[PDB]
Amino acid sequence: PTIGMIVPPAAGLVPADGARLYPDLPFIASGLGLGSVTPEGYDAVIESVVDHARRLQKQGAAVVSLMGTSLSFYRGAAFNAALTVAMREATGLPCTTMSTAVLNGLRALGVRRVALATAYIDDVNERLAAFLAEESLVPTGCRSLGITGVEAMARVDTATLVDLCVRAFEAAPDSDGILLSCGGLLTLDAIPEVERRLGVPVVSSSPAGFWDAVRLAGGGAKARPGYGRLFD
Numbered sequence: 001p002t003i004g005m006i007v008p009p010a011a012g013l014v015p016a017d018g019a020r021l022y023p024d025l026p027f028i029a030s031g032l033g034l035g036s037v038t039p040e041g042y043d044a045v046i047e048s049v050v051d052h053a054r055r056l057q058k059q060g061a062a063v064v065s066l067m068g069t070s071l072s073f074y075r076g077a078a079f080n081a082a083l084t085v086a087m088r089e090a091t092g093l094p095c096t097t098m099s100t101a102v103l104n105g106l107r108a109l110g111v112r113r114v115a116l117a118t119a120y121i122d123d124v125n126e127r128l129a130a131f132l133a134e135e136s137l138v139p140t141g142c143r144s145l146g147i148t149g150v151e152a153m154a155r156v157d158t159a160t161l162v163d164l165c166v167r168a169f170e171a172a173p174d175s176d177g178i179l180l181s182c183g184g185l186l187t188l189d190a191i192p193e194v195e196r197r198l199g200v201p202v203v204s205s206s207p208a209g210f211w212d213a214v215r216l217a218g219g220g221a222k223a224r225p226g227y228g229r230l231f232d
């Protein structure tokens with residue numbers, strides 16, 4: 001089934017991980033035009049999420065994921081659930097969000113104490129921690145990049161991402177796993193290196209978004225190897 005994705009950047013591309021994780025699967029995307037990875041930024045596009053879900057339905061999507069973590073967590077857990085209900089009601093399609101994806105990924109891996117490694121400024125990190133706590137997880141510490149650029153996220157390199165995850169875990173080595181948050185990051189080469197070095201799993205925004213959306217679509221598709229314990 002064709003999977004539709006609402007993505008933060010204006011360009012509206014399918015996030016790059018899809019072709020690596022699931023080369024055989026069809027994805028389509030619609031771009032919100034988010035201007036900054038900040039609460040003020042989210043407020044300027046959040047009301048258009050329902051319309052973009054409908055656009056994707058009109059293009060033949062059979063499920064829709066809102067592929068933005070902070071866009072979906074910044075107002076707390078209830079709003080993540082409510083926005084999902086709104087999308088479903090507007091389209092009659094199964095819908096999900098990237099915040100739901102990462103929650104599901106951490107749960108699937110049995111992660112309760114979670115170290116945070118993020119691209120964000122601290123206001124956004126505080127909101128992430130509050131969301132996770134509402135959902136019965138225990139954030140243990142946090143290291144972050146403090147980036148507000150949207151398209152800028154794709155340019156953070158692998159070595160930077162590995163170092164970020166390692167530093168986050170170093171701060172709390174009793175953690176069960178690591179949440180690497182920001183769906184604009186290109187994390188697929190970082191994940192196996194971090195898991196190799198540390199011995200704990202990483203749940204990363206974009207790959208968890210794909211994993212969750214493919215689960216939602218129901219076909220039982222398996223990801224290509226080398227992308228983390230989440231993919232078996």
Ligand SMILES: O=P(O)(O)Cc1ccccc1
Nearest residue numbers: 008068069070182183184
């Ligand atoms: O995962 P988040 O918090 O929505 C940030 C993001 C998502 C996609 C592209 C750029 C930035």
